[PDB]
Amino acid sequence: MLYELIGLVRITNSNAPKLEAKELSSTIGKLIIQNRGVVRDIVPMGIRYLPKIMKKDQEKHFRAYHFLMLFDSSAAVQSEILRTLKKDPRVIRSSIVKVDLDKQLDRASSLHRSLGKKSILELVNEDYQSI
Amino acid sequence: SSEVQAACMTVRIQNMANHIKEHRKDFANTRNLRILVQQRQAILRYLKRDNPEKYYWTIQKLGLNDAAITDEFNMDRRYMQDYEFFGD
Amino acid sequence: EKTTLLRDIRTIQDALSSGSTPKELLEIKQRYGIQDFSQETVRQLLQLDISGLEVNLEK
Amino acid sequence: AEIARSSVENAQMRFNSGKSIIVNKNNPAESFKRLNRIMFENNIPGDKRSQRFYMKPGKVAELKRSQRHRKEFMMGFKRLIEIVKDAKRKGY
Amino acid sequence: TLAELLGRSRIAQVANNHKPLTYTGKKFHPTHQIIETKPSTLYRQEWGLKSAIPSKIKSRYLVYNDLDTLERITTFEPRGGTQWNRLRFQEMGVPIVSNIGRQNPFFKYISRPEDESHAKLSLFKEMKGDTDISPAAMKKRLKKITALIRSFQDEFKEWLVENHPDELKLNSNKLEDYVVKFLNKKLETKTNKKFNTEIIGTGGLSYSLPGKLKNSPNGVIQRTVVPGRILNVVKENNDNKWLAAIGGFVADVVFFQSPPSSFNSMGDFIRMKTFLFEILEASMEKNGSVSMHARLLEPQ
Amino acid sequence: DSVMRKRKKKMKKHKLRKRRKREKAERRKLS
Amino acid sequence: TKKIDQSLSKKLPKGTIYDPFDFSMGRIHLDRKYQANKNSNRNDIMKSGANPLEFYARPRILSRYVTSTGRIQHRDITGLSAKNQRRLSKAIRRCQAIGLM
Amino acid sequence: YKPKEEVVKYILHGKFTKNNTHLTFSSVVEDKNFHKNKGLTYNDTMLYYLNLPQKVKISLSTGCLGFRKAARGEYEAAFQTSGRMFELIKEKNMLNKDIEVVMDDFGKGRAAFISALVGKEGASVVKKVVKISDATKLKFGGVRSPKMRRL
Amino acid sequence: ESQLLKKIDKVFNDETEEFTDAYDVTSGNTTLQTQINNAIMGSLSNEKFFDISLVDSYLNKDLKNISNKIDSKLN
RNA sequence: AUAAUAGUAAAGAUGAAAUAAAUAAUUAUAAGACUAAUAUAUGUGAAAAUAUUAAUUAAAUAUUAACUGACAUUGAGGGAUUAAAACUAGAGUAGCGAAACGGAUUCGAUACCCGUGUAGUUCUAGUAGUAAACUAUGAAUACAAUUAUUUAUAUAUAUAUAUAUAAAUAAUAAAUGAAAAUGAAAGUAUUCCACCUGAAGAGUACGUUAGCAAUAAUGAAACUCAAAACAAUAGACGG
Ligand SMILES: [K+]
Ligand SMILES: [K+]
Ligand SMILES: [K+]
Ligand SMILES: [K+]
Ligand SMILES: [K+]
Ligand SMILES: [K+]
Ligand SMILES: [K+]
Ligand SMILES: [Mg+2]
Ligand SMILES: [Mg+2]
Ligand SMILES: [Mg+2]
Ligand SMILES: [Mg+2]
Ligand SMILES: [Mg+2]
Ligand SMILES: [Mg+2]
Ligand SMILES: [Mg+2]
Ligand SMILES: [Mg+2]
Ligand SMILES: [Mg+2]
Ligand SMILES: [Mg+2]
Ligand SMILES: [Mg+2]
Ligand SMILES: [Mg+2]
Ligand SMILES: [Mg+2]
Ligand SMILES: [Mg+2]
Ligand SMILES: [Mg+2]
Ligand SMILES: [Mg+2]
Ligand SMILES: [Mg+2]
């Protein structure tokens, strides 16, 4: 099944804002590819201010690095990833939504589909045939 | 053909029964399972009238017997306890 | 058999374009039964049933 | 450090609630009127009053049904009045 | 038969129109057909419609949408004022000219493919001119076309290897050119939007040909003077020209050097006074509007 | 049946409930 | 006074045709009465054919359909179809749960 | 490295219930040497400046002005209590920095407080008020309210 | 893991652009032109992302019986 | 609820009242229950029910193609599910709240209003099978005159509407009806099931079956009476 993870990582060090996000993406990506899974895309969303002050593991946060990760795995692996994210102190909020593949095998991230690009081939073919 | 319909229902019955064994309080899908099992009985009862030779061949291959098909069945609480549907 | 179709079809197309005849090919001539290594032998190793269906449907 | 000092203005107003008005030093009574409009367009006074006492779900459903009917009935009434006025203007 | 007669009846001649009779947007041209009744028929509320128009109506001109409705009334507005805008334009005797120097749309000119060198610009305009098309009916232009174009694959898999084989073995820069031409050549026979609904030229506002001089008892008229009104007392924001109301049209007025002092004096009531203007040129835009340029002739 | 008529059944049900509570109480003391 | 409130004067666009009635107060009142946000469709993503549920991670677009306090607007105000209103509300509720809106 | 407590603004909070009106005047104090402390992260600094400590200066109710029992929840009680607050803010030299008014509920004293601040009684305080806001607390489901009163 | 390390570096790099969704960025046809060309040309297409026509012509001795035909014509 | 902080002297409640370093404000911590807008319960579900988010499993739509060849309808008995309250066992217990104990009101107040608030309301595993469990309207099939409004599928184009065919809802013709009204049924017909035969006695008594229990199902007769009931009409009256 195709899944879309949206994680809000903590920005502890203002000098290295995209450090825990890179370390986290590697941890999650390794779980996926080591359990028969495929990582289709990793779309960084940048530092954004949280809608409110949020709390996690007796800590407070006002900003986080947003990142998206489109990956293919089994339901058991998807639940394992979610369990690790809900326990990691780095992760402030994490959501995994299923992306239906009943009609087509290649679906882009919701962010891209919102912009009209329905498949990764459309994104790649707009970076080769026109770039 | 009635034999094909019974076989196709058997696959779904087997899958639905496995679901119920893990979701014993899912009464909505227990009701669906009951109706599907009763539908399979109806199609096979017609087959026995239409082509008796195929009927006996079909039920033997599916693992059923004439009694399972002709006898009134309600998949009630006594059945769940006499055949240990949920185990223990 | 670690040998893969793609790799085997990449040796029958390089040996047929370079002239090399390592014993692997003889083995490949047994893995697939393709005694002769020509451009019209890889095309018959990769035939898909769909192609036959398309012609039966036209008839 | 100063990085945490020069980035507090937006941060302060980035977590807004939507129930605040910047007072117009000239006409300070116009800002209180603007705040009142927000309260009524978010039904804040009505919600607060409706949360003072518990109402049974059946009664809640009845009131919601009746209120919707009255809202739709008023829209149908206004549509018919517009037709009357237009018909009168053309001499019907 | 009765059906044949009905198709040719005067009511059938009026094209179906459901456009709002009360429109508050920007009006660039007439939207409804003006209906006129003679004085004798008006005395009897006869307009050639289904039902008698209410006697309150004293005008002899109306515009309507529906002959009858569920409300048992006719949907009409007793106005015919777009005819006076056209007749006032005729009185100003300013021919409409093309700012792009295009051929006259009212003459059957022998045109050539000079602009047809943009075959890939307009052949794809059929699928790319979908600014306001449904999200799925426009998507039906992708599979429906793909099958039609895919049915010409065999024809183009032989013509291209018989007329330009070198390109197929060297580069596709020219192959793409042969593709755009192929479809158009095989589409000119087809009828895709064979009827074009775009406004043709002036749209009927003026059928006057440029060139003629206006003879007068005081000699040939060299500059057309027309009374008008200045709407704003401050030039259009971001534009170096004010706006005037001349003959039912809003024009852009250019002043000689300075703005008359009556502007500051009058202020927002400047529209209450009438000035004399000179109509420099009149152009037609694709939206169907008329771009009238004027000049505030001031007593000197 | 109307509310008026329902009220007669209501009274009969109340008197039966009142009598059964009364009987219960006695059994408790007599037990 | 040489000044008039904008609400008491109509500015005729350039290139448009007008009637004498366009200078009256009736035109002013008539334009107020029939002033509807009909140009929203061309600027309304959710009235274009896109699935509102694909915007659950784009709070900026979703924030156009909630009040200042975050209350989802009734369909009477949004003007969306039943399906889009249903999908849009789901997107907003999901966005709120993820921690973005 | 040294406590440098300074006032940044004042908060005038009004709680307008059905039976009383409570008016609190507070000071938003900021230790201007907080960033000069050791072992302080960028997050702790930003979190300290996003919710600065507050100190209560004036606390008033309608019973402090002599209104008793049922009179405490009336319009006149709130208007006079609002005046006494606007006076005590000038008599304590607390009208130098900007004031932010926070109103809580919609009792009869809410409109009296607004009238007393947009009128003569609050002509000094109103000049310093920079932001007005509402802080009415609503519940999304939450605890069960008491049963409706049959009266 | 090699692909993962290369992807992470290329996406979380200062040079890389990140979808911050703060403004309506400005600029279909590209992907629609690849479809049109692959529908007309088919096997004899120049698109990097071709259709099954090319794979069908290969296994049907068409892309080869046409290459020889073109070359024979050139002769 | 607890703690801190400054800051004070009243606070809380009501028709008005009185009963039990505060209230208010800003922080921090803990716990249980609930689910604002959207929202129409629209829709979905056999009914009961069902609206904070995600995931897993199961079920559910339309058209087309092929296939089976009456395999269907209804359904006694039977089976399954079934709100709230109640009960058994173990956890939980913020708020609400039978009872109980107090404060008021009143001529009296075993009430309505206020306080303190136990069971219960929550979760897990069970028992029980009852509601104005209501559309007070069993299910299925064939059929009959219109309009309006949505929804869905399809078709077309001079590309955004237009034309079709279903479904839903609203108002109706006919028809039906004691009328109120029903309106695609409460119409025209067919098939199957449940149920009724004056009121009161009575859904009671007795027996039986089932349940830990409360109870649930089944379910009379005597005596007495010439009543009793529904729709609608005109009044009178209404804090
Ligand atoms: K419903
Ligand atoms: K037969
Ligand atoms: K039967
Ligand atoms: K039965
Ligand atoms: K409790
Ligand atoms: K009901
Ligand atoms: K029945
Ligand atoms: Mg059956
Ligand atoms: Mg009855
Ligand atoms: Mg009071
Ligand atoms: Mg209580
Ligand atoms: Mg407190
Ligand atoms: Mg809700
Ligand atoms: Mg419904
Ligand atoms: Mg049945
Ligand atoms: Mg217990
Ligand atoms: Mg009490
Ligand atoms: Mg049970
Ligand atoms: Mg009972
Ligand atoms: Mg019953
Ligand atoms: Mg119910
Ligand atoms: Mg059925
Ligand atoms: Mg009983
Ligand atoms: Mg009656």
Q: Which helix H or strand E contains B85, and what residues bound it? A: none
DSSP chain E: -HHHHHHHSHHHHSPP--S-SS--S---S--S--EE--HHHHTTT--SSSSPPPTT---SEEEEEESS-TTSS-EEE---THHHHHHHHHHTT--EE-TT-PPPTTS-----TTGGGGHHHHTTHHHH--TT--TTTTTHHHHHHHHHHHTTHHHHHHHHHHH-HHHHHH-SHHHHHHHHHHHHHHHSSS-SS-S--S--TTTTS--PPTT--B--TTS-B-S-EEEEEE--SSPPTTSS-EEEEETTEEEEEE-SSS--THHHHHGGGGGGS-EEEEEEEEEE-TTS-EEEEEEEE---
Contacts of H68 (CB under 8 A, 6+ apart): none
**CA separation for the pair E131, C47 (Å, rounded):** 45
- Phi, psi (5° rounding) for residue A97? -115, 135
Q: Which helix H or strand E contains C57, and what residues bound it? A: helix C49-58
How was this entry determined? Answer: cryo-EM
Residue B75 Cα to ligand 4 midpoint, Å, equals 16
* G64 and I CB contact within 8 Å: no
Q: Are I63 and I57 in contact (CB under 8 A)?
A: yes
Taking an 8 Å cut-off on Cβ atoms, the answer to whether G49 and E29 are in contact is no
Q: Are H103 and H133 in contact (CB under 8 A)?
A: yes
In three-state secondary structure terms, D22 is strand
Superfamily per CATH, domain A2-124: Ribosomal protein S6/Translation elongation factor EF1B (3.30.70.60)
* I56 and C CB contact within 8 Å: yes
Chain CA centroid to CA H51, Å: 16
The residues with which H31 forms a beta bridge, in sequence order, are: H5
Taking an 8 Å cut-off on Cβ atoms, the answer to whether I30 and A25 are in contact is no
Q: Are G72 and G66 in contact (CB under 8 A)?
A: yes
Residue H143 Cα to ligand 5 midpoint, Å, equals 12
Q: Which helix H or strand E contains A41, and what residues bound it? A: strand A38-55
In three-state secondary structure terms, B21 is helix
**CA separation for the pair E131, E127 (Å, rounded):** 10
Resolution of the coordinates in A? 2.6
**CA separation for the pair A40, A54 (Å, rounded):** 30
Contacts of C31 (CB under 8 A, 6+ apart): C1, C3, C8
User: Domain residues of chain A, as ranges?
Assistant: 2-124
**CA separation for the pair I58, C48 (Å, rounded):** 11
Residue type, G13: P
For residue E130, count other CB atoms closer than 10 A to its CB: 13
- The alpha-carbon gap from E256 to the nearest alpha carbon of chain D, in Å, equals 43
Q: Which residues of D, range 27-86, sit inside 8 Å of E by Cβ?
A: 83
**CA separation for the pair H30, H51 (Å, rounded):** 10
The residues with which H24 forms a beta bridge, in sequence order, are: H13, H59
DSSP I7-65: HHHHHSSTTS------S-----HHHHHHHHHHHHTGGG---SS--HHHHHHHHTT-HHH
Chain CA centroid to CA A22, Å: 11
Q: Which residue has the tokens 């009828």?
A: E191
Reference E80, options E47, E118, E112; nearest CA is E47
Residue type, E169: K
Chain CA centroid to CA A76, Å: 18
Half-sphere CA count of E3, side-chain side, radius 13 A: 0
Residue type, E261: S
Whole-number distance in Å between F3 CA and J16 C1': 38
**CA separation for the pair H11, E149 (Å, rounded):** 72
**CA separation for the pair A2, A68 (Å, rounded):** 13
Give the 3-state DSSP-derived string for chain H, with helices as H, strands as E and coil as C: CCCCEEEEEEEEEEEECCCCEEEEEEEEEEECCHHHCCCCCHHHHHHHHHCCCEEEEEEEECCCCCCCHHHHHCHHHHHHHHHHHHHHHHCCCCCCCCEEEEECCCCCCHHHHHHHHCCHHHCCCCCCEEEEEECCCCCCCCCCCCECCCC
- Phi, psi (5° rounding) for residue E148? -65, -50
**CA separation for the pair B23, B12 (Å, rounded):** 16
Residues written for chain G: 101
Q: Which residue has the tokens 């912009």?
A: A115
Q: Which two tokens stand for residue B59?
A: 């039920």
Burial class (CB in 10 A: 0-12, 13-18, 19+), E108: exposed
Q: Check residue E238 and give left, alpha or beta (phi > 0: left; psi -120 to 50: alpha).
A: left
Taking an 8 Å cut-off on Cβ atoms, the answer to whether A61 and H41 are in contact is no
The residues with which F6 forms a beta bridge, in sequence order, are: none
In three-state secondary structure terms, G46 is helix
Distances (CA, A) of E230 to E246, E252, G28: 9, 10, 19
Half-sphere CA count of H114, side-chain side, radius 13 A: 24
Residue type, B53: E
**CA separation for the pair H3, H34 (Å, rounded):** 8
In three-state secondary structure terms, A46 is strand
**CA separation for the pair H10, H128 (Å, rounded):** 10
Subunits next to H (3 or more Cβ pairs <8 Å) are A, D
Q: Which two tokens stand for residue H43?
A: 């997050």
Q: Which two tokens stand for residue E186?
A: 């095989």
Q: Which helix H or strand E contains C45, and what residues bound it? A: helix C39-45
Half-sphere CA count of D91, side-chain side, radius 13 A: 13
**Window H115-134, strand J contacts by Cβ < 7 Å:** none
Residue type, E123: L
Residues E238-269: b if buried by 16+ CB within 10 A, e if exposed: eeeebbbbbbbbbbbbebeeebbeebeebebe
**Window G41-60, strand J contacts by Cβ < 7 Å:** 41
Contacts of A117 (CB under 8 A, 6+ apart): A108, A123, A126
DSSP E245-294: EETTEEEEEE-SSS--THHHHHGGGGGGS-EEEEEEEEEE-TTS-EEEEE
Q: Check residue G70 and give left, alpha or beta (phi > 0: left; psi -120 to 50: alpha).
A: left
Distances (CA, A) of E91 to E79, E94, E290, H11, H78: 21, 8, 15, 72, 74
Give the 3-state DSSP-derived string for B24-67, with helices as H, strands as E and coil as C: CCCHHHHHHHHHHHHHHHHHHHHHHHHCHHHHHHHHHHHCCCHH
Reference E29, options E300, E295, E249; nearest CA is E249
Q: Which two tokens stand for residue H88?
A: 């005590």
**CA separation for the pair B44, B52 (Å, rounded):** 10
Residue B41 Cα to ligand 22 midpoint, Å, equals 17
* I22 and G CB contact within 8 Å: yes
